[PDB]
C-alpha cells in the first residue's frame, strides 16, 4: 500500500505540474489582454478630452 501510494503521488505530481503551468499561462494571457484594453480605453479618453477642449 505504501508503494502504491508513493507511485500514485509521484504521478499526481506531474499532473499537478501540467495543470499549474496551464493555469499560469492563462493568467498571464488574461493580464496582458486587460493591459491592452486599458491602453485602448485610455487613448480614446485622451482623444475625447482633446475634442471637448476644442469645443
Amino acid at each position: 500500500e505504501a508503494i502504491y501510494n508513493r507511485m500514485r503521488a509521484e504521478r499526481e505530481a506531474v499532473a499537478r505540474r501540467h495543470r499549474s503551468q496551464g493555469q499560469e499561462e492563462a493568467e498571464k494571457l488574461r493580464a496582458t489582454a486587460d493591459y491592452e484594453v486599458t491602453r485602448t480605453l485610455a487613448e480614446a479618453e485622451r482623444q475625447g478630452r482633446i475634442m471637448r477642449g476644442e469645443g
Binding site: 499549474s20 503551468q21 493568467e27
Partner: protein, 53 residues
C-alpha cells in the same frame, strides 16, 4: 504466527496507518508548495501589467 490479541489489533494497525500518514502529510505539503508557487508567479505578472497599464 505471533499476532497480538484482537483488542490491540486496532491499535497496532493504527500505528501502521500513522506511520504511512506521516509520509502522506509530507507529500501533501510538497504538493501544496508546487501548486502555490505558479499562482504567485501569475499574480506577480498581473501586478506588473497593471502597473504598466
Amino acid at each position: 504466527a505471533a499476532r497480538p490479541p484482537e483488542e490491540v489489533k486496532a491499535a497496532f494497525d493504527d500505528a501502521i496507518a500513522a506511520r504511512e500518514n506521516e509520509q502522506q502529510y509530507i507529500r501533501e505539503a510538497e504538493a501544496y508548495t508546487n501548486e502555490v508557487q505558479p499562482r504567485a508567479n501569475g499574480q506577480a505578472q498581473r501586478i506588473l501589467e497593471e502597473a504598466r497599464a
